[PDB]
Amino acid sequence: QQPIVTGTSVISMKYDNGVIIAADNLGSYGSLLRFNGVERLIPVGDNTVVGISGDISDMQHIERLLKDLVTENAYDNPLADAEEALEPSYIFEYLATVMYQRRSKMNPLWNAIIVAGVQSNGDQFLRYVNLLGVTYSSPTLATGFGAHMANPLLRKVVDRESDIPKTTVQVAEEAIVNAMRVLYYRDARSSRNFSLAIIDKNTGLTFKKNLQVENMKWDFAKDIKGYGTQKI
Amino acid sequence: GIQVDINRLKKGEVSLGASIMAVTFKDGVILGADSRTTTGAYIANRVTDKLTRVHDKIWCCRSGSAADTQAIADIVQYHLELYTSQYGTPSTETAASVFKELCYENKDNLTAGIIVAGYDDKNKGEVYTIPLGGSVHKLPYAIAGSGSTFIYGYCDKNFRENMSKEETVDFIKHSLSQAIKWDGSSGGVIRMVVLTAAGVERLIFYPDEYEQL
Amino acid sequence: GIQVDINRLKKGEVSLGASIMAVTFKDGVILGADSRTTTGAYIANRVTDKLTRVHDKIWCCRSGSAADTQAIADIVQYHLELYTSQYGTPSTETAASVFKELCYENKDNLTAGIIVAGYDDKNKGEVYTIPLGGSVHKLPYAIAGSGSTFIYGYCDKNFRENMSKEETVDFIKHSLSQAIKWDGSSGGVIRMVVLTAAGVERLIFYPDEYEQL
Amino acid sequence: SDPSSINGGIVVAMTGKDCVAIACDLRLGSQSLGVSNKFEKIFHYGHVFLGITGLATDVTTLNEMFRYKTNLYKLKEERAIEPETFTQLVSSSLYERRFGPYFVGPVVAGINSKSGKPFIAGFDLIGCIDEAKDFIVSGTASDQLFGMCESLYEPNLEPEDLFETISQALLNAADRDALSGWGAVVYIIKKDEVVKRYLKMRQD
Amino acid sequence: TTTLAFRFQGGIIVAVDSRATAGNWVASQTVKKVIEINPFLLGTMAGGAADCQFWETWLGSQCRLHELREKERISVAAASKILSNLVYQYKGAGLSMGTMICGYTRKEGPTIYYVDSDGTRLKGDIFCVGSGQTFAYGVLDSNYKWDLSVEDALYLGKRSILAAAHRDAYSGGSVNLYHVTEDGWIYHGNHDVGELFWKVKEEEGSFNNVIG
Amino acid sequence: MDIILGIRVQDSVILASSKAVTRGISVLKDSDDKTRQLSPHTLMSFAGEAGDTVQFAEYIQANIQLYSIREDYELSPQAVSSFVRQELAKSIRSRRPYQVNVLIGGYDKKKNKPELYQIDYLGTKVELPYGAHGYSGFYTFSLLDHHYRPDMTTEEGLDLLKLCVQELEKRMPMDFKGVIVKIVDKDGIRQVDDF
Amino acid sequence: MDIILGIRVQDSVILASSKAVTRGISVLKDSDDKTRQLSPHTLMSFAGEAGDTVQFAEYIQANIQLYSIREDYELSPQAVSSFVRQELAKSIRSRRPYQVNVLIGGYDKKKNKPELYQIDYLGTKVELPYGAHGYSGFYTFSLLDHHYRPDMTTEEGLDLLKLCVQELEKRMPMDFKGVIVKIVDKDGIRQVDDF
Amino acid sequence: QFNPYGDNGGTILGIAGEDFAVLAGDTRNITDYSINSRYEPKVFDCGDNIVMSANGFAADGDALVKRFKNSVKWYHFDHNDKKLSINSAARNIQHLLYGKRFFPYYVHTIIAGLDEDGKGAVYSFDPVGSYEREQCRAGGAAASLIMPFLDNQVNFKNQYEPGTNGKVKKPLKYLSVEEVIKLVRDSFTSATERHIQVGDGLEILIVTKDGVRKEFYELKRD
Amino acid sequence: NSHTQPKATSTGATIVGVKFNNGVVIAADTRSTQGPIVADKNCAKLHRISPKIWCAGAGTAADTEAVTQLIGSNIELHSLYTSREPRVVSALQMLKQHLFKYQGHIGAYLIVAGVDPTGSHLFSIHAHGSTDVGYYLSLGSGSLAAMAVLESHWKQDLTKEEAIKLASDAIQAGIWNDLGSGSNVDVCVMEIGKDAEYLRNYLTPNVREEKQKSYKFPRGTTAVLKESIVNICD
Numbered sequence A: 001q002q003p004i005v006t007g008t009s010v011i012s013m014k015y016d017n018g019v020i021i022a023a024d025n026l027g028s029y030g031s032l033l034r035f036n037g038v039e040r041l042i043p044v045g046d047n048t049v050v051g052i053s054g055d056i057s058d059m060q061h062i063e064r065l066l067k068d069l070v071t072e073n074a075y076d077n078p079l080a081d082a083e084e085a086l087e088p089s090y091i092f093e094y095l096a097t098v099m100y101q102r103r104s105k106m107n108p109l110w111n112a113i114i115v116a117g118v119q120s121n122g123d124q125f126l127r128y129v130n131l132l133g134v135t136y137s138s139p140t141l142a143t144g145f146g147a148h149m150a151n152p153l154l155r156k157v158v159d160r161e162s163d164i165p166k167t168t169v170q171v172a173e174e175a176i177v178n179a180m181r182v183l184y185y186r187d188a189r190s191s192r193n194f195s196l197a198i199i200d201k202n203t204g205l206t207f208k209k210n211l212q213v214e215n216m217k218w219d220f221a222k223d224i225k226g227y228g229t230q231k232i
Numbered sequence B, C: 001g002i003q004v005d006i007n008r009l010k011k012g013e014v015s016l017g018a019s020i021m022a023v024t025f026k027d028g029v030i031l032g033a034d035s036r037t038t039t040g041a042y043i044a045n046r047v048t049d050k051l052t053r054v055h056d057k058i059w060c061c062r063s064g065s066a067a068d069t070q071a072i073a074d075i076v077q078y079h080l081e082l083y084t085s086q087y088g089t090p091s092t093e094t095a096a097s098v099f100k101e102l103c104y105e106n107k108d109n110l111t112a113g114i115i116v117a118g119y120d121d122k123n124k125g126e127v128y129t130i131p132l133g134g135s136v137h138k139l140p141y142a143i144a145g146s147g148s149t150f151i152y153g154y155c156d157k158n159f160r161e162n163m164s165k166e167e168t169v170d171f172i173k174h175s176l177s178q179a180i181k182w183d184g185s186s187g188g189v190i191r192m193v194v195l196t197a198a199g200v201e202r203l204i205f206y207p208d209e210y211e212q213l
Numbered sequence D: 001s002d003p004s005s006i007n008g009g010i011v012v013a014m015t016g017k018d019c020v021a022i023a024c025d026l027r028l029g030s031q032s033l034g035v036s037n038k039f040e041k042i043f044h045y046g047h048v049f050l051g052i053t054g055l056a057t058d059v060t061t062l063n064e065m066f067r068y069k070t071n072l073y074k075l076k077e078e079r080a081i082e083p084e085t086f087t088q089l090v091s092s093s094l095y096e097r098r099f100g101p102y103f104v105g106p107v108v109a110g111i112n113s114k115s116g117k118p119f120i121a122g123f124d125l126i127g128c129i130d131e132a133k134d135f136i137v138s139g140t141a142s143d144q145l146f147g148m149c150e151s152l153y154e155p156n157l158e159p160e161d162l163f164e165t166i167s168q169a170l171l172n173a174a175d176r177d178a179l180s181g182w183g184a185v186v187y188i189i190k191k192d193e194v195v196k197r198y199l200k201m202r203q204d
Numbered sequence E: 001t002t003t004l005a006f007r008f009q010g011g012i013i014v015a016v017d018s019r020a021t022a023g024n025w026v027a028s029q030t031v032k033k034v035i036e037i038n039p040f041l042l043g044t045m046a047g048g049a050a051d052c053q054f055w056e057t058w059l060g061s062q063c064r065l066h067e068l069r070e071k072e073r074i075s076v077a078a079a080s081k082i083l084s085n086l087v088y089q090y091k092g093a094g095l096s097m098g099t100m101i102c103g104y105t106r107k108e109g110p111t112i113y114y115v116d117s118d119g120t121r122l123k124g125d126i127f128c129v130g131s132g133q134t135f136a137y138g139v140l141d142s143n144y145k146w147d148l149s150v151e152d153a154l155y156l157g158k159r160s161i162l163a164a165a166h167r168d169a170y171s172g173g174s175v176n177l178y179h180v181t182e183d184g185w186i187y188h189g190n191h192d193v194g195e196l197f198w199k200v201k202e203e204e205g206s207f208n209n210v211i212g
Numbered sequence F, G: 001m002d003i004i005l006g007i008r009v010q011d012s013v014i015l016a017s018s019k020a021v022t023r024g025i026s027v028l029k030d031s032d033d034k035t036r037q038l039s040p041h042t043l044m045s046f047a048g049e050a051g052d053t054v055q056f057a058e059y060i061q062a063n064i065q066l067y068s069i070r071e072d073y074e075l076s077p078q079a080v081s082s083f084v085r086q087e088l089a090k091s092i093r094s095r096r097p098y099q100v101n102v103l104i105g106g107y108d109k110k111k112n113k114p115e116l117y118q119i120d121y122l123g124t125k126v127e128l129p130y131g132a133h134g135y136s137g138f139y140t141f142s143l144l145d146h147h148y149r150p151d152m153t154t155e156e157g158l159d160l161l162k163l164c165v166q167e168l169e170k171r172m173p174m175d176f177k178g179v180i181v182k183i184v185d186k187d188g189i190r191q192v193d194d195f
Numbered sequence H: 001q002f003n004p005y006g007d008n009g010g011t012i013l014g015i016a017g018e019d020f021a022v023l024a025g026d027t028r029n030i031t032d033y034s035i036n037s038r039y040e041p042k043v044f045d046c047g048d049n050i051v052m053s054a055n056g057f058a059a060d061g062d063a064l065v066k067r068f069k070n071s072v073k074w075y076h077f078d079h080n081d082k083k084l085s086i087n088s089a090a091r092n093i094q095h096l097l098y099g100k101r102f103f104p105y106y107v108h109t110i111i112a113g114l115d116e117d118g119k120g121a122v123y124s125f126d127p128v129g130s131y132e133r134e135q136c137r138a139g140g141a142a143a144s145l146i147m148p149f150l151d152n153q154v155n156f157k158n159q160y161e162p163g164t165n166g167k168v169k170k171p172l173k174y175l176s177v178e179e180v181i182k183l184v185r186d187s188f189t190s191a192t193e194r195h196i197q198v199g200d201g202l203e204i205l206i207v208t209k210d211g212v213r214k215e216f217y218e219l220k221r222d
Numbered sequence I: 001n002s003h004t005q006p007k008a009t010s011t012g013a014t015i016v017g018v019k020f021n022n023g024v025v026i027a028a029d030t031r032s033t034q035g036p037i038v039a040d041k042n043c044a045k046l047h048r049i050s051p052k053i054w055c056a057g058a059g060t061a062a063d064t065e066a067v068t069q070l071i072g073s074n075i076e077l078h079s080l081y082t083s084r085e086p087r088v089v090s091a092l093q094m095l096k097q098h099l100f101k102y103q104g105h106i107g108a109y110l111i112v113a114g115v116d117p118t119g120s121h122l123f124s125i126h127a128h129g130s131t132d133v134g135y136y137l138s139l140g141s142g143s144l145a146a147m148a149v150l151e152s153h154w155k156q157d158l159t160k161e162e163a164i165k166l167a168s169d170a171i172q173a174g175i176w177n178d179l180g181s182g183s184n185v186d187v188c189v190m191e192i193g194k195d196a197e198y199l200r201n202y203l204t205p206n207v208r209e210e211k212q213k214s215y216k217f218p219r220g221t222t223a224v225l226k227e228s229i230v231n232i233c234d
């Protein structure tokens, strides 16, 4: 078993009133950049966003499970849109259970997943889970290349817990958008087009589609000639 | 199916996977290339120069292994400099022959897909392509690199002989634009080198321009 | 490369390496395909029909394993016939879902790259592509098969939405012509199937015509 | 069939106030079988000391080789080789066999006779120099030695106190390694006197 | 590991080391390798630690159920066969166990059964099991007589483990002694090799290979 | 699987070596002498890969005999052992190494002391009071740890050796057809015919 | 490996079986009886994979004893051998086959004739005047081709057997610690204590 | 081909006193050469004055702890709210681990608490269930660095009484909670210096008859 | 040729190079690893090829030190032969041709930087013999963490002080986020018309805190069997 059509990095971070999460709109087929209209951020209710990387067929399977979870929660539940609504912590633990069960049957869902959201009591939720069933939480979280390149940049803003209240939504979103640009420079299986989602405890869920990487530095390339000695 | 070319590369070495092409036209010949260099899925260099000078008006496009193509191009440049000191300016055919000799005789230890392009006054613009095997093929235009697969259809339909400079630049720009769009191993800026009687001209084109073609 | 698509096949099985595509247009949708079937480098069948009916106005293009795609298409046709007996005419989306379910749940044992295309009266022409992984992708047009690699550049540059019937037929003909020219696994005649409100029309085009385009 | 862990053994070196210490175990085995409990791994050429862990045949071969090279050095230079110079000689000699290396983990220790500065250094099998103020470790219980040294070590220890620290580091590391132990030797090296002590340790 | 047990005039001597390894890493020096099944039955452990520990405590449960059902203490033969039939069901699955079931009953007398994970079950007077079994055999065989005293037999068992503890890299820690009579098993203490080696070297005058 | 033992006592060195030569499922010979005299007071026993053992032993023997003629002088056991070790140390990094393990028992006439050296095919030399190669050591070392004393006589050493052979005959899987015993002392080398 | 032999003579069947049980480089036991009595006039010797041998032998023994009680009648050696063969023939195509080879020596009371059957782990049965499993056959078969006669007595058969054991002790690589000999005849099964 | 195991690094440490017991563990979580989290706790209060940590492959570690916590819950339901003794918990964990003998939990487990005489207890487990009570145990990535230090400082190994000719050993005695925490903090700072997978933060859980207390300390973040 | 040694030291690292107004600056961390163990907590990864050409090295530690010294030796002889100050392209050419000849078996990954009569230069060399030119470059296990910072903050026309800040910030990103890198930050500045200044331990943000206890043993704690004076003199 292996992933065929794949999605690359998913990045995310916490800020004073909520969480931000982002992911590009590419479905790679090996080295071929085959599909360009792939949404890899999937909202669940008006308080959670699940970002998924890895195998896209397995992503679409998870989509259907989450869709079905909202339906099932509504059954015989008069408080489905109030006290007994789906929380980010519920949605995550469900997925984490599935991922670990599948790895334990030697038949894993190939993915790396980040569940971002805001709880009912206003607390920020951000936690990671992957094909192995491994889970962890941190002020910043990222998958694939994001882990190597985005996290370093995002940790300069929020290095520890105490930096979260000091970080505004403007500063946080700027860091995310910057990180997406760096990934476009340096990740061979990434695209310019991406989606971004903000879940705030006050202003709620804001889903931004069709964003582009901009303000790129390419001008210095013209001065670079040859690979050593060549002058022309 | 061309994963096999990448398969030939030594473990962990830098890969040139590329979108390179050379096109003859009325006034001479134009070489074109992307600027991406990869180590797996990490882009080691996003502003590479794959168009390299082996003589005043004989250049080449490099693809395959970065190390192998550089080592070869350096040796060829040495041979042609020594040729010039004894026998005067070498023909583009002569340059392609020296490339072939190195690529063919070391075909097992090398991964180098090279396009040779030059301008004589007698022979005008000429293009020779040298694939992995070490064979030589003289053509009106040539395409190569991992990204070239995606533009065989486009280039065959759109290429005409005796094009103008502006038409040839548009042909190369549109072609490499598509190759870059579809090939993950290709990207960055589009470098070009114009070879005519007038001299040598370097051109560059940035993403903001060519992406929205 | 294309190898790991063909590296999937079981030893000795018939290969459906292909040049298949489906294109939506003003009046509906058109499916297109070559007619070549190979066992290694031997052409087992030069007049194959890769465009197959799963319902009156829901057809599919097959690529990958001949056996696997046939077995799948037969099961889908059975499901949609049983669907029609109980719930009436199924949507093109419904057909694509049944294809996905079979391809995804049996992704390890199967090699089937299927394009689903159909005509509703409400939804007009629709195209869904289902690659090896078993994922579904709804698109304005789709290309697939070993020969599709060579026409990504051409098709992206030349495709427009809301084309006429004659324009779409020319678009498919020129595209598959190039795919056939460059891909050894593709060849023979170019079959097409037109899906509109008028009905179902079969078209064929022979080498003597399309080769010299 | 891993050359570095057939025979087993350990070496450790430390610095102190105007002194250095170098210590080693005495075991030589053939995998599980203990064969000799008298196999010393520390040698000296003039005032420069060299400890060597790893494949025993190479330990012996390198000792004979550096005895050879330091003797010719002395005849031509008309002086004893210094630790800094000897360290470079070991590095050169190991890298000369880059693609057919001696399977060893050598450790240099000594005091420079001119400047009086305490000096220690370690190498990998192909001659990569590892210089350190505090301590150097080598052998099949290197992980254990790293742990003991990092916690027990403090700078500017007197020779008598330094002896206790290095001895406790070696003993407790050796007892957590199956292929190391069976006795131990500790060298305490001052500017112009050198004391050699054999430690009592558990013989299993 | 190194474990042994031998039969003699005055019953059965059982002796084991206490080391546990994970490759060349010495993980523990204080492992109990003798399991006390009941006042008349002992079991030794060698091989996979978990396998031995788990299945021999399980064996003790099966022996208890026997005496509840049959109103009589289980025989050594029957107890050993429960274990040998169990591991035989897991043959090929990768269990690693080298055990000895030692005990006394009226009908059998003092009896020792070797039982290993590839299904072998053997009755016998002398057995040494483990990575250092050969080292123990060398000392034990060359000094063994049926007419040994309880004092001499206890010492020979202790000395045979010590010999193996010394030479075998994967044996050591401390020696646990047991003596089995008609009245049941009797524990004869934990003996650390740290002190025991030097005590034995001085008093016995042996171990001349070592720097005294 | 080939048994070679060595015991150094007060005034002599005793080497015991198995007589069996086995190929496949057949014992081709049961009276083989796995040793060569290097010099009047130096004896080397050997065991390992077929062919290599005798080829190596005789090659060393020739070199030591050449030295004796040239200098009209016998090399010390320490000197011979160092020469042998270096040859094996060269060998291990050759195209095809000698897969031979040896024991060198000698009497140094200048020191008036017996000496026993154990060298493996890698070139790993150790001086020992008692030594063994192959699987024999797994039994004999622990046995000798117990029974050996440094001040023993040659007769006490032979009884100590009998104790080893008995144990090996009891617990070894293969029939090695007994041993040939030889004693090295101040009066040279001699063979014990009845063992 | 393990040695199991069988010789059918005029009025009896003689089975010889090695006493050694070896694991690794240690002979764990030198008095092992590699046989089980299936019925008063039927004896089965066995050799092969550790554990499997005794587990198989006892399983057969139980089944034959169950038959004897049920029918109050002893099964003929031919009938027992056929039952054993079928069990091995089933076994070889199982998930984990019994890797056991056996010799079945019996005295048929109805025919008043001794019978010897050789069955391998595949379920390959043959009735023979003399038989052997493992590497033993490579020596004993040719020896018995020469010395065996069909009309021999039990005493002549034991001398013929001694000749086999001597040859094996001379030319076999492994020490198999002698053999336990048992005789099957009209008066049942008995063991020769001094061999 | 799919590999179901992974290494999440980290290291843990248990020490037992006279009337108390500590179970410490760093808060860093890693994969390969990347840091996943600087604060991800892996030492858990499981109720009945039992603290537990299962270091190694975090997914298996979490699954095990989760299952033991649940085992404690069902022990109360089935046996009239009886307190689960540390020795009983240890045996129960053995069966959890050995239950997956042929597809193991890749973890080194340590539990700590008080025995039924009120005295400090530490139990340690291998991946397949073999267990042993000890005064002292380090587990995880830096176990080989810390463990010999503990042999020397807790159990006074290789230390003799000065002037007694190496004849009289240093006498064993229980350590105070203050002295034990000193050894823990020094063990982890040393392990942080020399092991790349160890750092960020240290979380100690102390268990006395009064309950379970926590203490946190910063560690180097490189 | 031997296909790798696992025992051979191969340190994790973060080395970078940044070009500025009147020259070039390189920097590095100071951790040397053995597997997961930190062997040296303050090694020097910045090497001198010539007075004004310096070389940062990652990969197989023995190969980077050995190859930098060999080329440095030949560069010195070349400088004396030609009566000229050595050029960076000469070191570049000699390094790549050596590394290429061994087909990657010499695992040296280098950032070369310096000044010479031609101007200021910055190159990178990979083990297989390929070379790259750039204004900003990063190698080592923490190259991605460093390059993320370089891509975020680098601009054209950097000053000396800005380049040192950018370089050390890139190394810090490796120190904190990459497990292979750590400890201190070394820097070397090479400006045109001036001597190159080597700033050993330019930053030390990872100082070991005071230990809770002293582990100085009472004298006599260790049991001893034999004492003897060793003769070092003739």
Ligand SMILES: *[C@@](C)(CO)[C@](*)(O)[C@H](CC(C)C)NC(=O)[C@H](Cc1ccccc1)NC(=O)[C@H](CC(C)C)NC(=O)[C@H](CCc1ccccc1)NC(=O)CN1CCOCC1
Pocket (backbone or CB within 6 Å): E001, E002, E019, E020, E021, E022, E023, E025, E027, E028, E031, E033, E045, E046, E047, E048, E049, E050, E052, E096, E130, E131, E170, E171, H101, H104, H108, H126, H127, H128, H130
């Ligand atoms: C002598 C000492 C050696 O043979 C004895 O035989 C003892 C027997 C006593 C303990 C009963 N044997 C061992 O000590 C035994 C050796 C061994 C190891 C593995 C398989 C067979 C035999 N040691 C163990 O079993 C250790 C005991 C631990 C240290 C308490 N356990 C392990 O090595 C475990 C589990 C092994 C295992 C077996 C089957 C399936 C899965 C796992 N492995 C680890 O702990 C892995 N790892 C090693 C490095 O440290 C981190 C954990």
Ligand SMILES: [Cl-]
Pocket (backbone or CB within 6 Å): A227, B016, B037, B048, B049, B050, B066, I130, I131
């Ligand atoms: Cl390049």
Ligand SMILES: [Cl-]
Pocket (backbone or CB within 6 Å): C016, C037, C048, C049, C050, C066
């Ligand atoms: Cl078909």
Ligand SMILES: [Mg+2]
Pocket (backbone or CB within 6 Å): C180, C181, C182, C183, C184, C185, C186, C187
């Ligand atoms: Mg064709």
Ligand SMILES: [Mg+2]
Pocket (backbone or CB within 6 Å): D203, D204, E164, E165, E166, E167, E168, E169, E170, E171, E172
């Ligand atoms: Mg030992």
